[PDB]
Design a protein around this motif. Structure first.
Motif, PDB file in Angstrom:
ATOM      1  N   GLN A  78       0.784  -1.247   0.000  1.00 47.48           N
ATOM      2  CA  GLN A  78       0.000   0.000   0.000  1.00 47.48           C
ATOM      3  C   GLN A  78       0.814   1.294   0.000  1.00 47.48           C
ATOM      4  O   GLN A  78       0.459   2.268  -0.675  1.00 47.48           O
ATOM      5  CB  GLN A  78      -1.045   0.015   1.124  1.00 47.48           C
ATOM      6  CG  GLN A  78      -1.997   1.191   1.082  1.00 47.48           C
ATOM      7  CD  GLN A  78      -2.927   1.152  -0.117  1.00 47.48           C
ATOM      8  OE1 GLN A  78      -3.371   0.084  -0.537  1.00 47.48           O
ATOM      9  NE2 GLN A  78      -3.225   2.324  -0.677  1.00 47.48           N
ATOM     10  N   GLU A  79       1.887   1.326   0.784  1.00 48.25           N
ATOM     11  CA  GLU A  79       2.706   2.521   0.860  1.00 48.25           C
ATOM     12  C   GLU A  79       3.213   2.871  -0.540  1.00 48.25           C
ATOM     13  O   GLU A  79       3.340   4.040  -0.886  1.00 48.25           O
ATOM     14  CB  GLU A  79       3.898   2.291   1.798  1.00 48.25           C
ATOM     15  CG  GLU A  79       4.791   3.506   1.995  1.00 48.25           C
ATOM     16  CD  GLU A  79       3.998   4.760   2.296  1.00 48.25           C
ATOM     17  OE1 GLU A  79       3.146   4.704   3.206  1.00 48.25           O
ATOM     18  OE2 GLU A  79       4.222   5.793   1.618  1.00 48.25           O
ATOM     19  N   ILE A  80       3.489   1.861  -1.358  1.00 40.29           N
ATOM     20  CA  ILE A  80       3.994   2.157  -2.694  1.00 40.29           C
ATOM     21  C   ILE A  80       2.842   2.711  -3.503  1.00 40.29           C
ATOM     22  O   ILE A  80       2.974   3.748  -4.145  1.00 40.29           O
ATOM     23  CB  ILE A  80       4.669   0.936  -3.362  1.00 40.29           C
ATOM     24  CG1 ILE A  80       5.896   0.498  -2.559  1.00 40.29           C
ATOM     25  CG2 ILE A  80       5.125   1.321  -4.764  1.00 40.29           C
ATOM     26  CD1 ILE A  80       5.577  -0.093  -1.222  1.00 40.29           C
ATOM     27  N   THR A  81       1.710   2.010  -3.462  1.00 33.24           N
ATOM     28  CA  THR A  81       0.528   2.449  -4.173  1.00 33.24           C
ATOM     29  C   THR A  81       0.253   3.903  -3.796  1.00 33.24           C
ATOM     30  O   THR A  81       0.072   4.750  -4.662  1.00 33.24           O
ATOM     31  CB  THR A  81      -0.674   1.535  -3.887  1.00 33.24           C
ATOM     32  OG1 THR A  81      -0.467   0.273  -4.530  1.00 33.24           O
ATOM     33  CG2 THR A  81      -1.958   2.165  -4.437  1.00 33.24           C
ATOM     34  N   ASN A  82       0.277   4.212  -2.505  1.00 36.87           N
ATOM     35  CA  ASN A  82       0.046   5.596  -2.081  1.00 36.87           C
ATOM     36  C   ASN A  82       0.999   6.613  -2.708  1.00 36.87           C
ATOM     37  O   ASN A  82       0.581   7.732  -3.031  1.00 36.87           O
ATOM     38  CB  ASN A  82       0.000   5.739  -0.559  1.00 36.87           C
ATOM     39  CG  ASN A  82      -1.225   5.080   0.050  1.00 36.87           C
ATOM     40  OD1 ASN A  82      -2.117   4.595  -0.662  1.00 36.87           O
ATOM     41  ND2 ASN A  82      -1.273   5.048   1.380  1.00 36.87           N
ATOM     42  N   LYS A  83       2.276   6.239  -2.853  1.00 32.96           N
ATOM     43  CA  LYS A  83       3.292   7.118  -3.452  1.00 32.96           C
ATOM     44  C   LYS A  83       2.976   7.364  -4.949  1.00 32.96           C
ATOM     45  O   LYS A  83       3.162   8.464  -5.485  1.00 32.96           O
ATOM     46  CB  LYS A  83       4.680   6.473  -3.322  1.00 32.96           C
ATOM     47  CG  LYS A  83       5.446   6.808  -2.038  1.00 32.96           C
ATOM     48  CD  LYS A  83       6.723   5.993  -1.976  1.00 32.96           C
ATOM     49  CE  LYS A  83       7.460   6.201  -0.671  1.00 32.96           C
ATOM     50  NZ  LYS A  83       7.963   4.910  -0.130  1.00 32.96           N
ATOM     51  N   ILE A  84       2.526   6.316  -5.626  1.00 33.96           N
ATOM     52  CA  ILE A  84       2.187   6.399  -7.041  1.00 33.96           C
ATOM     53  C   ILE A  84       1.154   7.519  -7.225  1.00 33.96           C
ATOM     54  O   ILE A  84       1.151   8.242  -8.219  1.00 33.96           O
ATOM     55  CB  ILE A  84       1.657   5.055  -7.539  1.00 33.96           C
ATOM     56  CG1 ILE A  84       2.768   3.988  -7.497  1.00 33.96           C
ATOM     57  CG2 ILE A  84       1.091   5.188  -8.917  1.00 33.96           C
ATOM     58  CD1 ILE A  84       2.319   2.637  -7.981  1.00 33.96           C
ATOM     59  N   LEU A  85       0.294   7.682  -6.237  1.00 37.33           N
ATOM     60  CA  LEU A  85      -0.753   8.707  -6.297  1.00 37.33           C
ATOM     61  C   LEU A  85      -0.332  10.105  -5.847  1.00 37.33           C
ATOM     62  O   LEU A  85      -0.798  11.105  -6.389  1.00 37.33           O
ATOM     63  CB  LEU A  85      -1.911   8.268  -5.388  1.00 37.33           C
ATOM     64  CG  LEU A  85      -3.382   8.139  -5.792  1.00 37.33           C
ATOM     65  CD1 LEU A  85      -4.224   8.183  -4.517  1.00 37.33           C
ATOM     66  CD2 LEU A  85      -3.855   9.209  -6.762  1.00 37.33           C
ATOM     67  N   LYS A  86       0.515  10.190  -4.828  1.00 34.60           N
ATOM     68  CA  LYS A  86       0.847  11.475  -4.216  1.00 34.60           C
ATOM     69  C   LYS A  86       2.258  12.036  -4.244  1.00 34.60           C
ATOM     70  O   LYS A  86       2.477  13.200  -3.873  1.00 34.60           O
ATOM     71  CB  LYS A  86       0.457  11.354  -2.735  1.00 34.60           C
ATOM     72  CG  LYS A  86      -0.826  10.597  -2.517  1.00 34.60           C
ATOM     73  CD  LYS A  86      -1.996  11.544  -2.267  1.00 34.60           C
ATOM     74  CE  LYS A  86      -2.324  11.645  -0.785  1.00 34.60           C
ATOM     75  NZ  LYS A  86      -2.415  10.298  -0.142  1.00 34.60           N
ATOM     76  N   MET A  89       9.839  -0.150  -6.249  1.00 32.58           N
ATOM     77  CA  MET A  89       8.965  -1.215  -6.731  1.00 32.58           C
ATOM     78  C   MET A  89       9.833  -2.361  -7.261  1.00 32.58           C
ATOM     79  O   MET A  89       9.519  -3.547  -7.059  1.00 32.58           O
ATOM     80  CB  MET A  89       8.116  -0.698  -7.896  1.00 32.58           C
ATOM     81  CG  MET A  89       7.132   0.394  -7.499  1.00 32.58           C
ATOM     82  SD  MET A  89       6.139   1.012  -8.899  1.00 32.58           S
ATOM     83  CE  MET A  89       5.572  -0.379  -9.649  1.00 32.58           C
ATOM     84  N   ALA A  90      10.920  -2.017  -7.949  1.00 28.03           N
ATOM     85  CA  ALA A  90      11.791  -3.060  -8.514  1.00 28.03           C
ATOM     86  C   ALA A  90      12.519  -3.833  -7.394  1.00 28.03           C
ATOM     87  O   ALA A  90      12.572  -5.065  -7.384  1.00 28.03           O
ATOM     88  CB  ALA A  90      12.802  -2.428  -9.499  1.00 28.03           C
TER      89      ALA A  90
END
Ligand SMILES: C[C@]12CC[C@H]3[C@@H](CC=C4C=C(C(=O)O)CC[C@@]43C)[C@@H]1CC[C@@H]2C(=O)c1ccc(O)cc1
Ligand SMILES: [Y+3]
Lengths: 11, 224
Positions: free
Chosen positions: B23-31, B46-47
């Motif tokens: 989730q923390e990565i997903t959140n970064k993708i957005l903000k 992510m890699a």
């Protein structure tokens, strides 16, 4: 290897 | 499938079904801010994380973890790129969220000549309408390739890959009895996938020149 980390987490 | 084959697939699916962007990565993708440098950083995280998930998934492939504790290094080292690009094809075809991830990929210091084949490969994968079993088995097959640069025991690897190729073949016949060349199609896509070893190496070159910083793990696997 030499690839210590990869050898690592590959327990 | 025979029971031994269903067992093999059931365990591969149990593990492959655990892969998901944190989730923390997903959140970064957005903000996170939008910039070449930042985008590279997000992609680098992510890699790095995905290599760790590959390591674990590979550790569960039957027979793998009984191979020369170094021919093992050859495999993971040799297949990381192909596995990551196959995983990314899966996610861009599932979806947006990934709509945002693409915008970051398109401004992360990746030259347009590599952006082009990356999105064309995704479209070509999207076309095969692959099931989760197909993505899971193909990844396993990619990892267990007997042709990697540093393979001493090529025959042993060959022995562990075979059964997977056999399972995939039967699956194709079961779920697409009206598309007999589906299996051949999947094998051809694995061929296009291998070109990413070169695209990725060119990306590493441009990034290094452009002074980007990788991660201890990634520096190891890709010799930077
Ligand atoms: C391959 C890649 C890193 C891994 C990403 C992929 C795009 C989408 C993904 C989705 C995942 C999911 O939803 O689970 C796992 C991470 C991956 C598979 C990126 C496209 C280009 C980038 C790259 O090559 C790269 C390599 C080294 C770097 O330092 C930075 C980027
Ligand atoms: Y160009």
């Amino acid at each position: 290897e030499r690839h210590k980390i990869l050898h690592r987490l590959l327990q | 499938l025979t029971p031994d084959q269903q067992t093999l697939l059931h365990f591969i699916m149990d593990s492959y079904n655990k892969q998901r962007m944190p989730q923390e990565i997903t959140n970064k993708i957005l903000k996170e801010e939008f910039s070449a440098e930042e985008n590279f950083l997000i992609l680098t995280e992510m890699a790095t994380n995905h290599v760790q998930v590959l390591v674990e998934f590979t550790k569960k492939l039957p027979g793998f973890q009984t191979l020369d504790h170094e021919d093992q290094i050859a495999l993971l080292k040799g297949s990381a790129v192909e596995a990551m690009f196959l995983r990314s094809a899966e996610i861009f075809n599932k979806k947006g969220h990934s709509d945002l991830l693409e915008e970051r990929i398109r401004n992360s210091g990746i030259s347009d000549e590599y952006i082009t084949p990356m999105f064309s490969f995704y479209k070509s994968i999207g076309e095969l309408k692959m099931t989760q079993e197909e993505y899971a088995l193909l990844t396993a097959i990619v990892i267990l390739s007997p042709d990697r640069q540093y393979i001493k025991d090529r025959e042993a690897v060959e022995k562990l890959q075979e059964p997977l190729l056999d399972v995939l073949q039967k699956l194709c016949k079961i779920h697409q009895p009206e598309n007999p060349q589906h299996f051949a199609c999947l094998l051809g896509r694995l061929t296009e996938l291998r070109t990413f070893n070169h695209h990725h190496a060119e990306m590493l070159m441009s990034w290094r020149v452009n002074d980007h910083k990788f991660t201890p793990l990634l520096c190891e696997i890709w010799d930077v």
